[PDB]
């Protein structure tokens, strides 16, 4: 691969977010790009190491449902560059908007999400923060998985109490399925954070699966259940998860 | 960090086309993939080295309008894998289809095509076969540039014998603009190809820009003209080409 970007080529536009590592600016570089940037005139090794490692994982990714990693610049500032994403996240479309999706579109999102996730785990990568907030509907058609700039509902029980695993991401994908099939965040009636955190971690509290749509296929409900099994070992793997969802789509 | 894909991970079938050296299969690998394979023949040194270089450049490309490179396989056979492309090429949509595009989409395609090309040339890459056939409308919205003779896109200096340069690609992009802005293949009225080959090289034949669509903005007429200018040196560069297109689009 060739990942280093000539330095003076990037021009930063409107600041968008504060990111998880640096401030994020919608930029322009041979088209529309997004740039997470650090604006310190000289980077502390902490700041430098997060950069060095954040690039290290992205160096491995090449999938249509994973966000596109385009390169990095070291010298104007420590910067990471990716494609710009036209549209809104999965989170916004279900919760922060009136528009409900068609059941077909609902599974299609779950499908593409599975493909991106399957590919990630295949290259031995752990997301550690799968949520509808970190799932972007590029052009309202294509699912793009990333890490953008507080995730509690998608947290597996063993994470509440090396707890991050492939199975912890699987569970997180389960919660996302709930969002798609209910249009809702789990534990909507429980108010207090410590109550949810403790009840879900102790193994008493599990998402109310009766709220699923009528149109939701019975088989889809079963898969969603398996993903949310309290015992991490008893959770399915994304190969089978991807498998089942696609066979559903063909019908 | 390492792009080679272990054998039996990919499940092939649904072949689309077949060269004299290779075949393309709609595959399955963590989703929908496309696989170019060399299962037509034991690789000749040309094709085998062409393979080696084809991967070497794809390793370097990282763009939304450039085709997505996902990896390669050595052990079942020498294979290259990319994203699957949903839709049909620009060629098919303009000429081999009923669908006429809204002028907006013509510019959007023209802009995304420029972006992909600009990125390519920036990394010091020459395409050498820009045509509407090698431009794929993924999901009918997003342009994907790849490589899948064809002479309507052939620059004058290429007919005669570098000859292949960035300026030869610009001309080829010019013809594509003609396709987009006329809904037509150039010299549609001229019958025999052999006349065209000589005249385009000789300076006799020039695209008829009167066939341009009514909706086409004046700035587009000028840019399209400049791109297919006989003099290769005075031909614009894609940075400068892209520049006009974006600000043109920005005013709509
Ligand atoms: C600009 C950027 C650079 C790097 C990352 N990094 C990650 O997402 C990350 C860091 C570590 C691991 C992963 C994995 C591979 C685990 C995933 N998924 C991802 C995010 C971003 N944010 C980013 C990227 C594109 C965007 N398009 C449109 N809009 C409006 C945005 O807000 C936006 C934000
Ligand atoms: C499977 C494959 C692998 C590699 C390449 N190679 C190139 O495009 C190529 C070869 C050399 C240079 C370049 C560059 C980098 C210059 C560009 N652009 C590209 C093409 C393909 N063909 C390919 C890829 C996706 C497809 N989706 C839908 N349909 C229906 C297709 O026919 C199809 C074909």
UniProtKB/Swiss-Prot annotation, chain A:
Annotated GO biological processes are: animal organ morphogenesis; CD4-positive or CD8-positive, alpha-beta T cell lineage commitment; CD4-positive, alpha-beta T cell differentiation; cellular response to calcium ion; cellular response to xenobiotic stimulus; endothelial cell apoptotic process; epidermal growth factor receptor signaling pathway; ERK1 and ERK2 cascade
Q: What is the effect of changing residue 131 to R?
A: Blocks EGF-induced ubiquitination and ERK activation
Tissue expression notes? Brain and testis.
Q: Which residues form the Protein kinase domain?
A: 10-248
Give one GO molecular function term: protein serine kinase activity
The subcellular location is:
Nucleus; Cytoplasm; Cell membrane
- As stated in the Swiss-Prot or TrEMBL entry, residues carrying the post-translational modification Omega-N-methylarginine are 202
Q: Which residues are named in the active-site annotation? A: 129 (proton acceptor)
Q: Which UniProt keywords apply?
A: Acetylation, Allosteric enzyme, ATP-binding, Cardiomyopathy, Cell membrane, Chromosomal rearrangement, Cytoplasm, Deafness, Disease variant, Ectodermal dysplasia, Intellectual disability, Isopeptide bond, Kinase, Membrane, Metal-binding, Methylation, Nucleotide-binding, Nucleus, Phosphoprotein, Proto-oncogene, Serine/threonine-protein kinase, Transferase, Ubl conjugation, Zinc, Zinc-finger
Major localisation: nucleus
Superkingdom of this protein's organism? Eukaryota
- Changing residue 22 to V does what? In a colorectal adenocarcinoma sample; somatic mutation
Subunit details: Monomer. Homodimer. Heterodimerizes with RAF1, and the heterodimer possesses a highly increased kinase activity compared to the respective homodimers or monomers. Heterodimerization is mitogen-regulated and enhanced by 14-3-3 proteins. Heterodimerizes (via N-terminus) with KSR1 (via N-terminus) or KSR2 (via N-terminus) in a MAP2K1-dependent manner. Interacts with MAP2K1 and MAP2K2. Found in a complex with at least BRAF, HRAS, MAP2K1, MAPK3 and RGS14.
Associated disorder is:
Defects in BRAF are found in a wide range of cancers. Colorectal cancer: A complex disease characterized by malignant lesions arising from the inner wall of the large intestine (the colon) and the rectum. Genetic alterations are often associated with progression from premalignant lesion (adenoma) to invasive adenocarcinoma. Risk factors for cancer of the colon and rectum include colon polyps, long-standing ulcerative colitis, and genetic family history.
Family recorded in the similarity comment: Belongs to the protein kinase superfamily. TKL Ser/Thr protein kinase family. RAF subfamily.
Q: Specify the protein name.
A: Serine/threonine-protein kinase B-raf
Species the sequence originates in:
Homo sapiens (Human)
Q: What gene does this protein come from?
A: BRAF
User: Whole protein: which stretch is covered?
Assistant: 448 to 720 of 766
């Amino acid at each position: 691969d060739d990942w280093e970007i000539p330095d003076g080529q990037i021009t930063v536009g409107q600041r968008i977010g504060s990111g998880s590592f640096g401030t994020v600016y919608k930029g322009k570089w041979h088209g529309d790009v997004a740039v997470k940037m650090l604006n310190v005139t000289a980077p502390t090794p902490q700041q430098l190491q997060a950069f060095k490692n954040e690039v290290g994982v992205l160096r491995k990714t090449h999938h249509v449902n994973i966000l596109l990693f385009m390169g990095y610049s070291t010298k104007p500032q420590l910067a990471i560059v990716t494609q710009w994403c036209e549209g809104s996240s999965l989170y916004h479309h279900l919760h922060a908007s009136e528009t409900k999706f068609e059941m077909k579109k609902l599974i299609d999102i779950a499908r593409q999400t599975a493909r991106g996730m399957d590919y990630l785990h295949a290259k031995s990568i752990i997301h550690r923060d799968l949520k509808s907030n970190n799932i972007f509907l590029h052009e309202d058609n294509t699912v793009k998985i990333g890490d953008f700039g507080g995730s509690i509902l998608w947290m597996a029980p063993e994470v509440i109490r090396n707890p991050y695993s492939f199975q912890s991401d699987v569970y997180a994908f389960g919660i996302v399925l709930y969002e798609l099939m209910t249009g809702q965040l789990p534990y909507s009636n429980i108010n207090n954070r410590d109550q949810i955190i403790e009840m879900v971690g102790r193994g008493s509290l599990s998402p109310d699966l009766s709220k699923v749509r009528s149109n939701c296929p019975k088989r889809m409900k079963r898969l969603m259940a398996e993903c949310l099994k309290k015992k991490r070992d008893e959770r399915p793997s994304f190969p089978r998860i991807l498998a089942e969802i696609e066979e559903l789509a063909r019908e």
